[PDB]
Design a protein around this motif. Structure first.
Motif, mmCIF file in Angstrom:
data_model
loop_
_atom_site.group_PDB
_atom_site.id
_atom_site.type_symbol
_atom_site.label_atom_id
_atom_site.label_comp_id
_atom_site.label_asym_id
_atom_site.label_seq_id
_atom_site.Cartn_x
_atom_site.Cartn_y
_atom_site.Cartn_z
ATOM 1 N N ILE A 208 1.813 -4.534 -5.543
ATOM 2 C CA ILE A 208 0.449 -4.093 -5.261
ATOM 3 C C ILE A 208 -0.050 -4.704 -3.958
ATOM 4 O O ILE A 208 -0.698 -4.030 -3.149
ATOM 5 N N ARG A 209 0.247 -5.981 -3.725
ATOM 6 C CA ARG A 209 -0.217 -6.610 -2.488
ATOM 7 C C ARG A 209 0.498 -6.035 -1.268
ATOM 8 O O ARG A 209 -0.116 -5.839 -0.205
ATOM 9 N N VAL A 210 1.797 -5.761 -1.399
ATOM 10 C CA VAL A 210 2.532 -5.143 -0.299
ATOM 11 C C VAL A 210 1.949 -3.778 0.032
ATOM 12 O O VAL A 210 1.894 -3.380 1.201
ATOM 13 N N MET A 211 1.506 -3.034 -0.985
ATOM 14 C CA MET A 211 0.839 -1.766 -0.698
ATOM 15 C C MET A 211 -0.518 -1.994 -0.047
ATOM 16 O O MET A 211 -0.942 -1.207 0.806
ATOM 17 N N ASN A 212 -1.222 -3.053 -0.452
ATOM 18 C CA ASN A 212 -2.515 -3.358 0.149
ATOM 19 C C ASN A 212 -2.395 -3.585 1.646
ATOM 20 O O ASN A 212 -3.312 -3.245 2.402
ATOM 21 N N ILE A 213 -1.295 -4.206 2.082
ATOM 22 C CA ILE A 213 -1.141 -4.540 3.503
ATOM 23 C C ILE A 213 -1.314 -3.299 4.371
ATOM 24 O O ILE A 213 -2.143 -3.272 5.288
ATOM 25 N N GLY A 214 -0.538 -2.257 4.094
ATOM 26 C CA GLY A 214 -0.810 -0.921 4.616
ATOM 27 C C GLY A 214 -0.907 -0.787 6.119
ATOM 28 O O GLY A 214 -1.779 -0.065 6.617
ATOM 29 N N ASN A 215 -0.037 -1.471 6.859
ATOM 30 C CA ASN A 215 0.036 -1.363 8.315
ATOM 31 C C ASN A 215 -1.235 -1.835 9.009
ATOM 32 O O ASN A 215 -1.456 -1.520 10.179
ATOM 33 N N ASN A 216 -2.080 -2.588 8.316
ATOM 34 C CA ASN A 216 -3.317 -3.113 8.879
ATOM 35 C C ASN A 216 -3.080 -4.566 9.269
ATOM 36 O O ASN A 216 -3.054 -5.447 8.409
ATOM 37 N N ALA A 217 -2.925 -4.818 10.570
ATOM 38 C CA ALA A 217 -2.615 -6.164 11.040
ATOM 39 C C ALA A 217 -3.722 -7.165 10.734
ATOM 40 O O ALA A 217 -3.477 -8.378 10.773
#
Ligand code: ZN
Lengths: 139, 49, 49, 58, 98
Positions: free
Chosen positions: C29-38
């Motif tokens: 879920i956290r890896v999906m949260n990251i979502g290419n947003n630096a």
């Protein structure tokens, strides 16, 4: 004993020979500095929510393109890095690296869940599509 | 009054914990009350030679 | 070496044990949260630094 | 005063009675974690982040 | 691995031998000075009350150490605890006094 809520919902003892508090030792790593660093590193992650719907069903976030969204987030991260390092130019840049990354997409509020743009929000689309077929009394 | 919902009272030969839960929910049951303690995380950090 | 003493009690409740599957799902879920947003990667690396 | 279980220094008898509860001893709630080192005198307690007017507590 | 275990309901506390046994606070012991320094405060509170009036005896092994002398008149009562307590409670993970 009532615990509040953090958010809103639907509303001859002589002194024995051991004790003392003289503070002879001081730590070399530095307890205050280590606690400060731990406080900074303990924080949870930012909530990246744009692209997801609210209660009424309308997506959240700005109406900008996906790739330009990724680019803006990148150079905003660069500016924040410079601000944290306390300089004029960041030394660890997230933008304008040597890698060609022109296909990168970053979630934005331009696209709904179906896969269509929302230049007219979901509630408005539903309302007009339903109002297109109502009828009145004869007379 | 629906005696089917007051089963452990009306029905004499019924075990005190019997429940016909999927069909009819009972309005007089056997509840188990607790009283716990939730201490905080304690530690005594010792050093190593 | 950490040590944490205590007395014999049975009504103590410290709910903290889970399985690796739940940890892995949270990580996904956290890896999906990251979502290419630096912006959600920058503070982590800076503070660990 | 002092607790002979964790070797912490207290000041009031009610303080000792409230402190031994964290180890499991009775007598006659604001802290989340409570640590103490053995080579120096510097406990470190940890309290929730929403509470007000914390008096030197992480 | 020196671990202390508090006594409960009158039973005496115990410390862990190097070989895994746990013993009470009495008899002849042997410490490394680093072992004391790493726990200078947790050990004072637990042990000093027993060295003073109890039956405990410890051989802190050091190898070399600077000393200091205090002379007293033999025909009058003298007591060393005020000197030997201000040394134990000043042992530190980095320093020791004379
Ligand atoms: Zn205690």
């Amino acid at each position: 004993k009532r615990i509040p809520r953090k958010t809103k919902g639907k509303s001859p003892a002589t002194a024995e020979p051991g004790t003392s508090n003289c503070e002879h030792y001081k730590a070399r790593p530095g307890i205050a500095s280590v606690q400060k660093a731990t406080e900074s590193a303990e924080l949870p992650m930012k909530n990246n929510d744009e692209g997801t719907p609210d209660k009424r069903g309308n997506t959240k976030g700005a109406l900008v393109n996906e790739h330009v969204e990724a680019r803006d987030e990148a150079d905003d991260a660069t500016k924040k890095q410079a601000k944290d390092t306390e300089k004029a130019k960041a030394q660890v840049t997230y933008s304008d690296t040597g890698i060609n990354n022109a296909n990168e997409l970053s979630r934005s509020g331009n696209v709904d869940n179906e896969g269509g743009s929302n230049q007219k929000p979901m509630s408005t689309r539903i309302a007009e599509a339903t109002s297109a077929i109502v009828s009145k009394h004869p007379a | 009054i629906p005696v089917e919902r007051y089963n452990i009272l009306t029905n004499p030969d019924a075990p005190p914990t019997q429940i016909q839960l999927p069909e009819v929910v009972d309005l007089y049951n056997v509840v188990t009350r607790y009283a716990y303690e939730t201490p905080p995380i304690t530690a005594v950090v010792m050093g190593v030679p | 070496t950490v040590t944490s003493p205590y007395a014999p009690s049975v009504n103590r409740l410290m709910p903290y044990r889970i399985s690796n599957a739940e940890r892995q799902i949270s990580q996904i879920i956290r890896v999906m949260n990251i979502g290419n947003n630096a912006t959600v990667i920058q503070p982590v690396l800076q503070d660990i630094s | 005063y002092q607790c002979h279980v964790c070797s912490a220094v207290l000041f009031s008898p009610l303080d000792l009675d409230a402190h031994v509860a964290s180890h499991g001893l009775h007598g006659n709630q604001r802290h989340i974690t409570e640590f103490i080192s053995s080579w120096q005198n510097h406990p470190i307690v940890q309290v929730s982040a929403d509470v007000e007017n914390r008096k030197t507590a992480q | 691995d020196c671990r202390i275990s508090f006594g409960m309901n009158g039973a005496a506390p115990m410390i862990r031998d190097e070989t895994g046994m746990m013993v009470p606070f009495e008899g002849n012991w042997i410490f490394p000075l680093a072992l004391w320094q790493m726990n200078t405060r947790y050990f004072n509170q637990q042990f000093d009350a027993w060295i003073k009036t109890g039956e405990l005896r410890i051989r802190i092994e050091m190898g070399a150490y600077p000393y200091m002398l205090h002379y007293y008149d033999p025909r009058q009562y003298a007591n060393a605890w005020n000197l030997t307590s201000a040394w134990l409670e000043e042992i530190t993970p980095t320093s020791i006094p004379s």
